[PDB]
């Protein structure tokens, strides 16, 4: 607090509860664990070791000799569930999950703004264990010109503030920085700097075994009559993502309502896949006349 008419420092001290970011945690843990997520399964191990472990103990990692990650990026085709995995991190840390968008950091005037970037990391540090997930970034990972003038300067300031910070509170786990990006070809270095990161986890579109687990978890909440072969469906839906596998559940069930069934059947999955698969690439015809 400054005297706007004497020009002497009145009071000091960040008090910082701090409303502007207060609503951003805690989330009281999401309803989505690793149990509520299918098989990957090796990249599951990779997140738990990359993220949860250094967080309780930079000590055990130090004793070993190793360095914990600088930051962790999750990458893949959308619908694998990257923020879904992040909900999982949130469930096993048993803690803090700072929810804010990278869209709100880039703003049109000045030290709203800058202060906001520093606030998000101060907040993490006191509320710790944490766990800052921000959120699918492409825009803190823009390109500078020097300058096209309104956009750039803001993006350039917040980019330096971002990368410097994460480097410096994690030589060693204390705050784990997590994030995601959807597409990583569209961007010019920022997070694709290897001095700023070193753990890029590929989140793959699900294994032959992974599909079955996803299908399984989806029918768990739903009601079925036992005849459903979960393994068979997974064979057909190779090359899909995990979210599609939900849509097929939900769509199979909408078909069930149209048949007047309040349980789901094998007939219903074959029909739901058939909708999705067909729209890609053709399935009926022909028998002639001449092919007979």
């Amino acid at each position: 607090a400054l005297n706007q008419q004497t020009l002497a420092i009145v009071n000091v001290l960040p008090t910082s509860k701090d409303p502007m970011v207060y609503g951003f945690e805690v989330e009281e843990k999401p309803e989505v664990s690793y149990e509520d997520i299918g098989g990957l399964d090796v990249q599951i191990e990779e997140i738990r070791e990359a993220v949860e472990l250094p967080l309780l103990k930079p000590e055990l990692f130090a004793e070993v000799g190793i360095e914990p990650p600088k930051g962790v990026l999750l990458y893949g085709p959308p619908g694998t569930g990257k923020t879904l995995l992040a909900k999982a991190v949130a469930n096993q840390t048993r803690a803090t999950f700072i929810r804010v968008v990278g869209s709100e950091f880039v703003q049109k005037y000045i030290g709203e703004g800058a202060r906001l970037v520093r606030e998000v990391f101060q907040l993490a540090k006191e509320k710790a264990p944490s766990i800052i997930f921000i959120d699918e970034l492409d825009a803190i990972a823009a390109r500078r010109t020097n300058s096209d003038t309104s956009g750039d300067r803001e993006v350039q300031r917040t980019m330096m503030q971002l990368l410097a910070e994460l480097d410096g509170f994690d030589p060693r786990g204390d705050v784990k920085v997590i994030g995601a990006t959807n597409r990583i070809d569209i961007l010019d270095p920022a997070i694709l700097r290897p001095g700023r990161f070193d753990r890029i986890i590929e989140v793959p579109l699900p294994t032959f075994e992974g599909r079955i687990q996803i299908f399984k978890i989806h029918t768990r909440k739903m009601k079925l009559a036992e005849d459903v072969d979960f393994k068979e469906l997974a064979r057909i839906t190779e090359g899909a993502s995990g979210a599609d596998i939900k849509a097929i559940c939900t769509e199979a069930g909408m078909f069930a309502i149209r048949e007047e069934r309040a349980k789901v059947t094998m007939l219903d999955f074959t029909k739901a896949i058939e909708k999705v698969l067909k729209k890609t690439t053709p399935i009926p015809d022909l028998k002639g006349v001449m092919f007979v």
Binding site: N11, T15, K17, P19
Partner: protein, 49 residues
Amino acid sequence: LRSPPLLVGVVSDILEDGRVVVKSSTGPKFVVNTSQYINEEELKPGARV
């Protein structure tokens, strides 16, 4: 004093010292008290003042 002209702002933050951080639409923030019959219990961030 409650007579016009009055400048619209919103509450940014609540602090431990009887005062509320107020970001006016013009620009600058100010650290100022509420009134007697306006409390920090009533006030909330995003509360237009």
